[PDB]
Structure 1
């Protein structure tokens, strides 16, 4: 639950394979795991759509960061084929991936670098940066100027 809470670090599910296996083996708690796998197809849909759900959720988490994870290398670190990653993109087109940038020559994707209208985006960033430097520069300047008065 803590790994699924937030800031999901890219980890291998093989460590979770034995966790789920012993989750089916031990009967002290969470016993009805065989009842979760009761149906021949329902448990398979919950498992495939479960690993799919976390392999999409971690993409939704790393999509906030603009670090350019270079999903071409990520497909190599995840040890999976690029075809089911294109199917994952087929899940992203319904997952509202409209804010993205792809490349015809290479395979690197970009979740940022829009047309960047200078009257809205650079306007906003320059407003928060310049104004934040102005008022933040204003607070501790005279605040420290009042802190040095106690030395007399």
Structure 2
């Protein structure tokens, strides 16, 4: 549960099945793991749905830390095909739960959005105002504080 927090906890489902798949087989006590997964059809869909939850966790962190990403890199990082990665992402965007857009003639997809001249200029003034005038106000007063301690 710590590994499924955020910031990828850097993970991969192939590694996840080969270190915790022993937890799904016999152990010391272990019994809710055999109770939830490992069944005939009830656990088996829950094997699939855990796969669904971890790939959904990997999409949201990609939207955090990528301007763009090629289609072949997303396929090899989600442990699944190119066509499945198309349809799984196309499901999430018609559900509009992850806000992305693709270009499948070249495979280069993007996560960022087209910003506006009202918006880019608003970001230009924001870094200008809030953290070049105020921090310059801030440095001056600690600079006066050093004259207190150092002389005499």
Shorter-chain TM-score: what band? 0.7 to 0.9
1:63 aligns with 63
Name the CA distance, whole Å, in 2 between partners of 1:107 and 1:14: 24
1:103 aligns with 103
Q: Contact 1:116/1:122 (CA < 8 Å) preserved in 2?
A: no
**TM-score using structure 1 length:** 0.74
Label 1:133 to 1:41 Cα distance change in 2 as closer, same or farther (>3 A): farther
Q: Contact 2:102/2:108 (CA < 8 Å) preserved in 1?
A: yes
Q: CA RMSD of the aligned region, Å?
A: 3.2
Label 1:129 to 1:3 Cα distance change in 2 as closer, same or farther (>3 A): farther
Label 1:2 to 1:49 Cα distance change in 2 as closer, same or farther (>3 A): same
| Most deviating of 124-133 and 6-15 | 124-133
Gaps of 5+ in 1: none
The offset of 1:14, in angstroms, is 2.4
Q: Which has the higher contact order (CA 8 A, sep 6+)?
A: 2
| Most deviating of 92-101 and 139-148 | 139-148
**TM-score using structure 2 length:** 0.74
Q: Contact 2:7/2:61 (CA < 8 Å) preserved in 1?
A: yes
Gaps of 5+ in 2: none
Label 1:25 to 1:83 Cα distance change in 2 as closer, same or farther (>3 A): same
Q: Contact 2:14/2:79 (CA < 8 Å) preserved in 1?
A: no
| Paired positions, count | 152
The offset of 1:5, in angstroms, is 1.2
Q: Deviations over 1:58-81 (max 9, x none)?
A: 111221223434343231344521
Q: Deviations over 1:1-38 (max 9, x none)?
A: 22111111553322222333311333323323332236
The offset of 1:98, in angstroms, is 6.8
